[PDB]
Design a binder for this molecule. Structure first.
Ligand SMILES: CCCCCCCCCCCCCCCC(=O)O
Length: 221
């Protein structure tokens, strides 16, 4: 259905597109971003389609792409990630058609959605304002060139968050992802923040770190 949105009180001069995690909807994150909303920023939380998930023996659940395993050597749904990223590209392009330029748009997500937002930002030619990647990883690591990506977003700013007690997406997945991100874009704009005791969820301190990151890269007027 239609994405869960936190409308800008005013006119929207910026936008945040946040992608939920596996099995979720956009409603919960939309409500979370309502608590850190800035009156000139529209917040968009799309809903992943219900689809079979291989690791659950194809029980159908909301998922941006198929998951085969949790190990860093598990085969990844290459065509699904790529096609899902193309859907997010279209979601960014329509916000531009409606008024908000892409360089006024932050793309982000949590876990599977955070993986998708990272892949999308690093492979699209639309210039984005930044990335907020929570408790996630870089999908299709080895498909990336061996140096900087170059192109639109080679200087994109990435705030990446992770809980140090995550049992599902281990903390070392995020830190290694941040190591890869530092070789893919300008490392002076890549921030890795860890939250002690936090598992595979979010905390208010992280939500306020996220707002501080959004408010600086997307200030008014
Ligand atoms: C960058 C190196 C580490 C990551 C290498 C690939 C690991 C992929 C496995 C992670 C799948 C996690 C399942 C999603 C959970 C959720 O969406 O909440």
């Amino acid at each position: 259905p239609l994405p869960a949105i936190v409308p800008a009180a005013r006119k929207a001069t910026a936008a945040v597109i946040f992608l939920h995690g596996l099995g979720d909807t956009g409603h919960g994150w939309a409500e979370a971003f309502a608590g850190i909303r800035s009156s000139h920023i529209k917040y968009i939380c799309p809903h992943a389609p219900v689809r079979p998930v291989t690791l659950n023996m194809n029980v159908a659940m909301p998922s941006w792409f198929d998951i085969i395993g949790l190990s860093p050597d598990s085969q990844e749904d290459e065509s699904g990630i790529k096609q899902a990223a193309e859907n997010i590209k279209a979601l960014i392009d329509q916000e531009v058609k409606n008024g908000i330029p892409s360089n006024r748009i932050i793309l982000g997500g949590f876990a599977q959605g955070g993986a998708l937002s990272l892949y999308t930002a690093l492979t699209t030619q639309q210039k984005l304002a930044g990335v907020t990647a929570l408790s996630c990883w870089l999908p299709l690591r080895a498909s990336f060139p061996q140096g900087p990506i170059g192109g639109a977003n080679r200087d994109i700013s990435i705030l990446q968050c992770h809980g140090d007690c995550d049992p599902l997406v281990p903390l070392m997945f995020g830190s290694l992802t941040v190591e890869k991100l530092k070789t893919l874009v300008n490392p002076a704009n890549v921030t890795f923040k860890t939250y002690e005791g936090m598992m595979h969820s979010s905390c208010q301190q992280e939500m306020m770190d996220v707002k501080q990151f959004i408010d600086k890269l997307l200030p008014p007027i």
